[PDB]
Design a protein around this ligand. Structure first.
Ligand SMILES: [Cl-]
Ligand SMILES: [Cl-]
Length: 499
């Protein structure tokens, strides 16, 4: 299991009493109530000392937000989750972005959960503790004291089940983030709801065959963990680094790479952010797709697993070859789509023909083909006997496997150079053989760019492009919408080949 943040034997060495006497802003905090334990009134200054006057002011506001959450009606959480969590969002946004306020926040939560007379309030503070642990840790100056506080809470008698469950889940999520590294976003409402109730976040991942897979994750769950989990659950090879699958984000059809160490919950936050930014129009999916094409089979692995992987991939490739950015050959699209129809629907009927327009779009033909070559399609379809599902499927897979773009990681690009020979719009098709420049207009490979020519620790890229070095030492500045995908593909193929 995960390494302890603090051993049981060190619990007695790290007492918050000592931390608080040495670090609290005692003079400026002078008040009626005890400064070191629960109080119902606002604090008159920050708990810790901030040289930045603005951070002192914000620390005081944070405390008001803590009080507000502690005192809020359980009914708001159901009727208006956005309102219910607003004070939480304020706290976590400040702490995540401003490292020098993190210990302040934790000290306020320790304080408000110390000698807290009312059980329901103690429960609210421990929910806050758990939200905070799920977002950022205390700094190295406080973390051992806070960890001692957690373990003491977990190990001693007292606290309701709710406080103890929150404390245990808080300690564990701190361990998970120590393992998986920092996150980048404040929890969405959906995540906070799960954290509050001490349960996993449930996410739905779409597979290439359109099927819906469920995963139970936590705040620290990475793309790599979830990609491995989905692989194992689909009975593929269990290591996504071997099978080459990852989970990507899809917003209204536009796909973006998710890095292996990136947190899926951070993607959920972005979704919520966009929903607000657009004020519905948000068609978001996670998608489980094949990213990397390694020649690493056997490794004497069950062919059964390799087979599940390959079926997911055929759906992906078929769909990509229906994408005009990758393929413009109507004859070809007709040939694969007509076989797919024979497989799924069997022999032609006038009832099928009457069903196609609109329905078959993206499934058996492209809109372009529904408009300019329907009859040509209906004709190729009629042509297939008699074809058994087995034969129909085998022929389709053959046509797919022999396409130039089969078994390549695909990236849509453009360039603006006046001294390079390629067309403005091209595809980079990356595989173990190199970085291939492909022209989707003619279905031809134009050049095979070498991984061995790229800078190993200084690959040049920006927000919109990656600069790839050609054999003659000139640079192709490939513009692409998903720069991270292109950069990571170059790095991952290079590393694989190195080993
Ligand atoms: Cl001081
Ligand atoms: Cl400061």
């Amino acid at each position: 299991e995960l390494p302890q943040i603090l051993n049981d034997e060190e619990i007695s060495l790290y007492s918050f009493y000592d931390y608080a006497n040495k670090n609290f802003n005692i003079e400026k905090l002078k008040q009626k109530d005890d400064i070191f334990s629960y109080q119902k009134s606002h604090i008159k200054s920050s708990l810790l000392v901030h040289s930045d006057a603005e951070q002192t002011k914000v620390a005081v506001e944070i405390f008001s937000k803590v009080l507000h959450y502690m005192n809020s009606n359980p009914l708001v959480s159901k009727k208006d989750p956005a309102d219910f969590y607003s004070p939480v969002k304020f706290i976590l946004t400040k702490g995540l972005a401003i490292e020098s306020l993190r210990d302040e926040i934790y000290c306020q939560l320790i304080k408000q959960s110390t000698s807290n007379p009312i059980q329901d309030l103690n429960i609210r503070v421990w929910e806050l503790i758990h939200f905070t642990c799920s977002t950022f840790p205390p700094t190295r100056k406080l973390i051992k004291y806070f960890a001692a506080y957690l373990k003491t809470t977990i190990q001693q008698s007292d606290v309701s089940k709710s406080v103890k469950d929150s404390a245990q889940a808080s300690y564990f999520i701190l361990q998970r983030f120590t393992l998986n590294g920092a996150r980048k976003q404040v929890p969405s409402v959906t995540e906070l709801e799960s954290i509050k109730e001490n349960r996993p976040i449930f996410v739905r991942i779409t597979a290439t065959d359109g099927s819906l897979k469920g995963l139970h994750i936590d705040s620290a769950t990475t793309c790599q963990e979830s990609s491995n989990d989905l692989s194992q659950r689909s009975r593929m090879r269990v290591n996504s680094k071997e099978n080459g699958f990852t989970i990507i984000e899809s917003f209204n059809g536009i796909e973006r790479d998710i890095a292996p160490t990136d947190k899926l919950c951070d993607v959920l936050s972005k979704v919520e952010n966009l929903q607000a930014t657009l004020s519905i129009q948000v068609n978001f999916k996670f998608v489980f797709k094949k990213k990397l094409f390694f020649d690493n089979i056997t490794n004497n692995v069950p062919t059964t697993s390799i087979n599940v992987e390959n079926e997911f991939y055929y759906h992906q490739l078929f769909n990509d070859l229906f994408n005009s950015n990758y393929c413009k050959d109507q004859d070809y699209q007709i040939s694969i789509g007509s076989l797919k129809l024979q497989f799924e629907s069997s022999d032609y009927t006038d009832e099928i023909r009457a069903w196609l327009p609109g329905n078959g779009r993206g499934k058996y033909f492209t809109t372009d083909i529904e408009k300019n070559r329907f009859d040509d399609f209906i004709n190729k379809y009629k042509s297939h006997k008699g074809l058994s599902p087995e034969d129909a499927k085998k022929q389709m897979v053959q046509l797919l496997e022999k396409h130039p773009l089969a078994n390549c990681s695909l990236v849509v690009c453009e360039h603006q150079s006046e001294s390079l020979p390629y067309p403005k719009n091209f595809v980079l098709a990356l595989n173990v053989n190199g970085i291939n420049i492909y022209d989707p207009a003619t279905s031809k490979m134009l050049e095979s760019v070498k991984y061995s020519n790229q800078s190993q620790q200084n690959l040049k890229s920006d927000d919109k492009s990656v600069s790839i070095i050609l054999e003659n030492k000139s640079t192709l500045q490939a513009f692409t919408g998903d720069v991270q995908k292109l950069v990571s593909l170059i790095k991952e193929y290079s590393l694989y080949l190195r080993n």
